[PDB]
Design a protein around this ligand. Structure first.
Ligand SMILES: C[C@@H](Sc1nc2c(cnn2C)c(=O)n1-c1ccc(CCO)cc1)c1ccccc1
Ligand SMILES: C[C@@H](Sc1nc2c(cnn2C)c(=O)n1-c1ccc(CCO)cc1)c1ccccc1
Ligand SMILES: [Cl-]
Ligand SMILES: [Cl-]
Ligand SMILES: [Cl-]
Ligand SMILES: [Cl-]
Ligand SMILES: [Yb+3]
Ligand SMILES: [Yb+3]
Ligand SMILES: [Yb+3]
Ligand SMILES: [Yb+3]
Lengths: 494, 494, 494, 494
């Protein structure tokens, strides 16, 4: 069931959201926001800078003060507000999916059926945790009563990427709010719009002012302001590994603010000779090509055992030749554009290395169309490990297919990277499935599938693919700060 | 019961410990180690540098490899090795306490009765966790079986301070080993000796080679090598907040290694008019003066309600005038020296600010003796908030006593610091105890006591007093890395 | 805000609810349901017997089969259905509160503001747990992968009392459904009506057929059928301790079905001389008199320290003399009737023992009105331990006030009972609050309050006041059955 | 490495152990204890009856009193005592294994290498939990501070079977003591001796008097006294399902004491056509034949897919023909006797039903020797579901092998029993392994193995094979009683 918006979308919310009201920028500057499919300007949005981040942090800090409505309300009521926010996003699902598609260059079918469904489900999941965050009573040595409080940390700075704007917004704000924090969100310069609509719904839902503040703008200005701020308690960032290093560095320099990072990858799949071949081809395909390759988990190195390698490449290539490029809003279209020029160039530049360094181009390998940042879906076979396309995150519709014959060696090759976000193992053998997934240095390991993400399980990177986890029970720990309270008593009893 | 060593202590272990063997430094340089009470050289120890840290990390990495003895042994057996290590430390308790006293400038009674007891107890606590570290099975959306592995992270770099050398060594290695990590430990340049004895006991206990590697040396060389190493997965550091910022920065610059920091404080006590006055005086006293003030939790701002302030100061001062300074090995001695010159100067320099900025000197305020880094126990009353002695961590035997009359205001004053390691609340009122301890921005809040530390509860700082927690159930999380494994199945059932 | 129903209530649902359809009884018998305030017949309801319970269990068993919709749906979707049920109960809050008031003899203000609010909140709480029920991955000795599944148990028989019909229905079905069980509910013979309305809302919400089946009827017939059934996996019962013993016995005789029991009490309060006197009087008052004394937690022995005893009795008695008896639907009325004749007689019979055994009657002590099972609010002072009114659960508006002078002795006296559901401690002293609450053999201990129940914390009895806990995280364990799955592997790694 | 005792074993401890001293029976009666291999009397032991159980419960109750040494000692110290007990059992491993072999009819190699190793390991596991039992702090609605205490329950009655006397003793006392309970243990009438030696080691280790009391004697006298006692808080029983029903019934009749039951089974294995055939044969073999078939988990129905059935039967039969019967103390002996006459008769009687009801006798099927309760190892093929040997627990060395061709049907057949202790699944297919183990109504499901038991994972039965779980984290819950403490406060903050 794929319903659509009957009237044309109008952009309404374009301002900095602080204390549940709409603010002009302190400078009074604004910045344009584009459709990546047409290269046309959609609207202008107020440009937040350091001065605006400062207003946002003061609002967050006041909303966090002992005795405030957000600190004193029942945990169950924090949950209620979150479930209300989810109902409102559900009510505005058509509007949000359309805006997400138009601004993000994201296929509308996927925006509506996956992105918005995952947004609503993740919020509902997080709402349920709010009054289930618990500390401990602890049988300490000596005559003492010891308990712990898993408090909110405080003001959390949250920097959101452009590839899944709504999903990433909710992955940040859901847990942070469930645990009782206040937030200053900086959506991506490319994709501020859907977040600003969500902010209007945060107001409608009745969150106390200052609990969520959204400051659109650029990364080197507003993002740097967040990462170096002396009164932000924690920064959460999803994006490139390069920028992640700057975030962590700045946190260290400033006020030792807590850090979680969800970064890029060069995620490997290992396809054994006994694998269901079609299932492995289909999931490895979608594993690399989903959302024009603009997923941190992109299955960008597919190692296939020699005896099934040729047949894997053949079947893969024919699956890649089935796409229909164009406007993601038009039904039947199955591949939209890349987000912007910067990304578009890096993709094409990396495609050229594949050719020059001697990979076998099976299909694609150039641009498409008169407008929009479109790249033909590209498959390279006979890829080797020291090639640029096997080392660097492409973030584009570019599949690398490698051969192996030794399992020990292909595991070393899979692990031979500074990345470690995710990986895939395709086999019918129980022992292989368990032992290989244990040996892979990856945060999520999928077995006979790929790209299966859900609110109930933790998600994040090994190595330079991240610090910490988001979602699941485990991810909620990083939005709490633990206080131990130890009380002298005359005599304890067990 | 205070037994002693019958023969004089001989120093035996003075070398870099890698792969369970004793190594000369790569350069071949050595550095002297001193008794702080006599200023005499005790011995020379091999000086580890970047080149030696590199040998230690390669050993740790090999011991961590899939299929190694440490990775494949039963969790219960990791526990057994840890409980064996504790039995060996218990066997060598006299030797270790004497060495700890002589090298650290630490009162022997405290070394034997508290430091060594806490070392043994913490190891035994950690041993019990080893086969109780568990992941989850998760009711993910869709037809999938999802489980998590709480794996060890890998090679953990661990930098240990000089104030509690043995206790801090065990606080690091106990949890890291219980969870299955391998470690490269850099004990403090001032106090390498007790760690090198523990390393001999790690060998005796039968830990596989490379699981624990100890590299003595200086902070700016060996410590920097650890913090910037591209194949260390995690750094744990206890020390100054200043150096903590350098550690976190370097982690960001290098390989985004995971970070936990246990840093300094300017920890406040709030003494209400209804408090048991003598109990508050005794705990606030020991809270600031323990181990010559060289505790990160030093209760270095004591706020007392006006109506009991004069009587609190009087009783405090007379308690401070009861000390006997000298060699910590001599029975009856109740105050040893500061660790070294650098610390000694900072202490005296800060004592001079108290005088010049107009605090009331009640006793002390100068040095003591012909040898040793001794400082007279010092009490200042009528201390105000903008004084250096109320803002800066002294790390010396220097008590600050402040007056207050408003509870709201004294809580703001208590929280008005970038620090937040711990705090104390003294009152008989149930509501005051709970509400004040909730409102304090401190990692541990003691009620009608101070400095009660135990293996069963988590310990660490709010704000710039730390990132993360050590010990308790909660502290064990930061020595694991969580992997989600999601397996496609034909049909799930609840 | 106390809104009311504008039209008169009409009874609609009067039949046995199996497989989401309305069934006549197998015999074809029906039984009358009365208003306790007027003694008038409200309607007739279909009388379930053993033959009907058998139809209900076959439906529950089929809905529980591997591959069924309830077993295969996402846990998150079980949660969604529960949150939907809560929205529907909220929509029908006026109707439900009126029906609850009219059938249960329950003050409408309390029905609407407390009972229905707690019903809605408990369901929403339980909904949030559904996809957060998790097993473990376990570092077993040897080369094995071990995980656990916290499965639903299966068909759960649930017997609901008459004192809080809606709240008790939801306390049973919320957790049992959240965990994935199917249920056969037997509401009290006195109060079947509100449950049958909830069943219509279970249908409307879209729960698969057979997941909830409701069989009204009598205890000795339908309740016994449930407790002895050979294909019911678990029985949950709230009611008298006497019947609880029969339930547990029958479970043993039949198929060793799992048992949880929430039974009666003779719950004590200990009021120390330093207590806030008015707060202690107010909470102890409401602690015994709430819902005409028909609470399992009734604070039916109030021990007050000698020096404040007279003043406690005086203030208590004047609070008890403020009630307005009558129809619970009429505004201004502050005390409704007892549920039925059986209860009414036991209450009056026990009031007579108080008089005959020599308690001091301060007020009340007889019946009220021309119709309805009304008992005057009664206060006895100078009650002693071997009196019937100090040993037996009255379940009526009858307060017992005792004196004590020794704390050790009053704790023994408080604990000197086969009961142990709850207790109260009133004092300003931190140490007394902690030590007394630790020493009381009671499932819930309130400090400076009484009767504070919430979905987030576990609730149940020590001793013959119950087996197991309901609600909180802990209560959810008893609606799961744990399966260990141990898989042979070639080699494990930590 | 199989070492032995150099001198002959002498029996020393033969008396009732209460308050850490040795008691004659109240009557003054004694009962004989036999070697099952020779039918010779080993010694006489003091016969505990109801009057002796009463002395034991009064001792347990006093040791449990608030303020006692056991209630007030550090949790860590309960752990220490347990680890000390394990060291003492390790010291006496030869003595204990010999006594266990001689009294229990248990192969000495298995007694020494498995039973004693598992005893020591389980105790060490349990010791580690003692100071890691924790309650919660809970974000309750309203202005309250709520925490929970996971208290010990109190006096726990523990009834131990004869098949694994030491292992079962430690499975009971380890968790119960770790959690802070006191115990009254009734070892099996057949095998009291090893428990009485352990009691001497409990004294030596320094457990406070009354914490462990051991009352040897018969089941219908001392066991019934335990199950019906009005001051025992909990009964734990391992044995027949028949007696389990009597225990649960008596608990209900008496004081609603908490119950856990570990009962018998008729545990199925499902061997798929793709299974490693030799591995399935070897584990299914040991799964049924271990300890002369006297395991509650006996794999007593082996369903094998038709196409590999004949080859499975052939290989199974030849494995069964390899045994050497005799005295379990003699090296080379690989099968000892059944425990006693009662068991011996039931086994032979059930073997006769197999023959008369038309099973194919492949080997065995009669007694062996001139003395001792020896039964030839017996294999039946072509067993059908309504045969006595496929329905009733034999508890003897008697294997049943069945054929199947439909997976759906064989799962129904596997689940078609009132039992549900364990099961086995043998296959190479990932999906089959997960889906079949989910669908089996069994507490432990082994995949490509059988009889893998370890301290780290919970163990117990579905259906009439048990109530509750022992060991693992989960099993520790049933030795705690949860208390909720809810404290009124002026204002809460998250
Ligand atoms: C829409 C998905 S998130 C997601 N889905 C994907 C991806 C690739 N294919 N698919 C189908 C993906 O990368 N992602 C994705 C993965 C990781 C991240 C963050 C950092 O990598 C963002 C999106 C979801 C599902 C349930 C609940 C919430 C969200
Ligand atoms: C010996 C103690 S640790 C400790 N004890 C102290 C301190 C001050 N007074 N006392 C008595 C202290 O600072 N400490 C202390 C506190 C924090 C840290 C680390 C970072 O601050 C180190 C020592 C112990 C007890 C049980 C188990 C293990 C150890
Ligand atoms: Cl905690
Ligand atoms: Cl997890
Ligand atoms: Cl579990
Ligand atoms: Cl709890
Ligand atoms: Yb162009
Ligand atoms: Yb000097
Ligand atoms: Yb009447
Ligand atoms: Yb015979």
């Amino acid at each position: 069931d794929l319903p659509v918006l009957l009237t044309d979308l109008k952009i309404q919310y374009t301002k900095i959201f602080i204390n549940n009201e709409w603010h002009d920028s302190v400078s009074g500057k604004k910045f344009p926001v584009f459709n990546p499919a047409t290269e046309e300007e959609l609207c202008q949005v107020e440009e937040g800078d350091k001065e605006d981040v400062d207003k946002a942090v003061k609002a967050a800090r006041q909303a966090f003060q002992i005795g405030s409505p957000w600190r004193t309300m029942d945990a169950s009521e924090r949950g209620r507000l979150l479930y209300k926010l989810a109902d409102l996003i559900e009510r505005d699902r058509l509007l949000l999916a359309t805006m997400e598609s138009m601004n993000g260059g994201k296929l509308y079918s996927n925006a509506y059926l996956s992105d918005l469904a995952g947004c609503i489900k993740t919020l509902r999941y997080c709402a349920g945790w709010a009054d289930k965050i618990q500390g401990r009573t602890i049988p300490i040595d000596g005559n003492f009563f010891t308990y712990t409080r898993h408090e909110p940390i405080g003001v959390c700075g949250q920097i959101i990427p452009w590839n899944f704007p709504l999903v990433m917004l909710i992955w940040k704000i859901g847990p942070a709010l469930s645990c009782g924090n206040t937030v200053v969100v900086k959506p991506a310069e490319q994709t501020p719009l859907t977040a600003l609509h969500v902010a209007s719904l945060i107001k409608e839902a009745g969150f106390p002012p200052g609990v969520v503040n959204i400051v659109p703008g650029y990364g080197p200005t507003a993002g740097a302001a967040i990462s170096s701020h002396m009164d932000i308690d924690k920064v959460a960032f999803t994006g490139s590994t390069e920028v992640g290093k700057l975030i962590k560095e700045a946190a260290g320099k400033s006020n030792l603010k807590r850090v979680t990072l969800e970064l890029g990858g060069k995620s490997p799949c290992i396809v054994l000779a006994d694998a269901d071949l079609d299932n492995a081809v289909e999931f490895a395909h979608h594993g690399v090509f989903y959302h024009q390759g603009q997923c941190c988990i992109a299955a960008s190195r597919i190692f296939v055992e020699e005896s099934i390698y040729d047949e894997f490449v053949r079947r893969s290539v024919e699956r890649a030749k089935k796409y229909i490029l164009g406007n993601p809003l038009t039904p039947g279209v199955t591949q939209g554009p890349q987000i912007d020029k910067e990304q578009y160039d890096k993709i094409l530049d990396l495609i050229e290395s594949g050719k020059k360094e001697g990979a076998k181009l099976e299909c694609g390998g150039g641009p498409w169309g008169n407008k929009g940042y479109f790249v033909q879906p590209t498959v390279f076979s006979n890829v080797t490990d020291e090639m640029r396309i096997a080392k660097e995150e492409i973030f584009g519709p570019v599949q690398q297919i490698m051969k192996f014959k030794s399992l020990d060696d292909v595991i070393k090759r899979a692990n031979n990277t500074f990345y470690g976000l995710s990986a895939g193992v395709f086999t019918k053998d129980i022992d292989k499935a368990i032992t290989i997934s244990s040996a892979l240095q990856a945060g999520t390991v999928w077995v006979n599938c790929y790209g299966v993400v859900s609110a109930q399980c933790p998600f994040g990177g090994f190595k330079m693919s991240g610090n910490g986890r988001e979602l699941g029970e485990y991810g909620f720990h990083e939005y709490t700060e633990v206080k131990t309270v130890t009380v002298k008593i005359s005599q304890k009893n067990s």
